[PDB]
């Protein structure tokens, strides 16, 4: 019926997609995800929004999802919307492997998903995917990489970025204190912790509200790890001492 229709895919009097920019407003409130590209690896750090004395610890992560043997991504938005896209990404990657018998390049995998996101913004009468993703991976064409996407179905490669709550503050700090072409993995972790510290105004980093994963190439095989509590706490102690030394 015309009366109950919502008209989600129609042009605003000034040339704007309302449901699109709005869907970006929803993404401003999500957990803080921070990705940094290093000379030796890539890393994703995510603010663990959920923390309670009764939530149990399940899965190897709550926002970091593995896609291939040499890829991973983090989400920021609606898990129901995010879970749909994560499932589609795995299908796309495996479909490419079946066809070509070679792991899907990171750029192509991102393009495939971004193609899906554009479709939802154009036709169908369905609400846009209000989810933004940071992809990290390695491939024989461009080595380590880091990508970002928005509900607008648009994407771009970065050397370091963040999305979610207090993204603007992080990118500003990252823009100021990122050393292009001379950042090792350890420095990337240290920079991430510093960016995370300021980004969570509420309280401070307790080594539980943060989950970190690092992608590195070892013996010719990509390795994806999620840093445990011990090292996350160890990094935190290292940063605190550095802050005290500065002051």
């Amino acid at each position: 019926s015309r009366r109950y229709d919502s008209r989600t895919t129609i042009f605003s009097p000034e040339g704007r997609l309302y449901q699109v920019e709005y869907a970006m407003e929803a993404i401003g409130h999500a957990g803080t995800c921070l990705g940094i590209l290093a000379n030796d690896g890539v890393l994703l750090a995510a603010e663990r929004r959920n923390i309670h004395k009764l939530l149990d610890e399940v899965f190897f992560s709550e926002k970091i999802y593995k896609l291939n043997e040499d890829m991973a991504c983090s989400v920021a938005g609606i898990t129901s919307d995010a879970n749909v896209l994560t499932n589609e990404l795995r299908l796309i990657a495996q479909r490419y492997l079946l066809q070509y018998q070679e792991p899907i390049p990171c750029e192509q995998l991102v393009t495939a998903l971004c193609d899906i996101k554009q479709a939802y913004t154009q036709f169908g009468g369905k609400r846009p995917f209000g989810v933004s993703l940071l992809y990290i991976g390695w491939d024989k064409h461009y080595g380590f990489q880091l990508y970002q996407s928005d509900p607008s179905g648009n994407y771009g490669g970065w050397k370091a970025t963040c999305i979610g709550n207090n993204s603007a503050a992080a990118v500003s700090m990252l823009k100021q204190d990122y050393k292009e072409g001379e950042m090792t993995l350890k420095s990337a972790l240290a920079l991430a912790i510093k960016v995370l510290n300021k980004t969570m105004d509420v309280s401070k980093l307790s080594a539980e509200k943060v989950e970190i994963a690092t992608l590195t190439r070892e013996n010719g095989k990509t390795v994806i790890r999620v840093l445990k509590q011990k090292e996350v706490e160890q990094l935190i102690k290292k940063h605190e001492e550095e802050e005290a030394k500065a002051e």
């Binding site: 229709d5 129609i10 997609l17 607008s152 648009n154 970065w158 292009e180």
Partner: protein, 232 residues
């Protein structure tokens, strides 16, 4: 299957959704293409390098085929989709006609694609205007512009997106056979036009060049800087 009439006439004889999409094309970046005697040049003014963004993945000039390339101005995602459909069609024509596509032909296909998206049911007009350049089999340089309205035309040169009209006026008064006498003059001609819109210059405009036989070539930042200095 959502099948509602998205675009529908309005009193005084107009199509809103087509107009609105046109403004969306305006707010984009400024892109300029000129047709030389034996060279066709495209340029674009970059909103922001951002000092972190990898410039590789933000290319706004692409090759539909070895002898066809285009530049756009508008919604990026709508631009990436349109390019894919053009690329597959170019191969399909190569498969059947056994000859390279013509700039005029591919422009008609892309234009025909957009025209099908305004009139269709449950769809949104494409928010991009595309500038298609390429050398036909005869070798005559070609330049085509397509608006979201689906209308396409052949030009000596023109500009889309933010800062279009002013640039075109600059092109109209400053375009001449003498300016198109040499390849360098054509390239400098483009840069001055963008500089008419973009501020920084040299570091804020990406330039590309297509020759008769050679494939697309993207000018290095050093080459762009050298040309900018020559103009100054």
């Amino acid at each position: 299957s959502y099948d509602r009439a998205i675009t529908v006439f309005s009193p005084d004889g107009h199509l809103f959704q087509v107009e609105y999409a046109q403004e969306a094309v305006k707010k984009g970046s400024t892109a300029v293409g000129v047709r030389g005697r034996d060279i066709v040049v495209l340029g674009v003014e970059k909103k922001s390098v951002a000092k972190l963004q990898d410039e590789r993945t933000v290319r706004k000039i692409c090759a539909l085929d070895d002898n066809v390339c285009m530049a756009f101005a508008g919604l990026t995602a709508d631009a990436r989709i349109v390019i894919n459909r053009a690329r597959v069609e170019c191969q399909s024509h190569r498969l059947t006609v056994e000859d390279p596509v013509t700039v005029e032909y591919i422009t008609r296909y892309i234009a025909s694609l957009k025209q099908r998206y305004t009139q269709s049911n449950g769809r949104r007009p494409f928010g991009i205007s595309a500038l298609i350049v390429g050398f036909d089999f005869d070798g005559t340089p070609r330049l085509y512009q397509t608006d979201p309205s689906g209308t396409y035309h052949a030009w000596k040169a023109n500009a889309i997106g933010r800062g279009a009209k002013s640039v075109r006026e600059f092109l109209e008064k400053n375009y001449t056979d003498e300016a198109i006498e040499t390849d360098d003059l054509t390239i400098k001609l483009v840069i001055k036009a963008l500089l008419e819109v973009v501020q920084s210059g040299g570091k804020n405009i990406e330039l590309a060049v297509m020759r008769r036989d050679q494939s697309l070539k993207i000018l290095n930042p050093e080459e762009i800087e050298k040309y900018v200095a020559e103009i100054e």
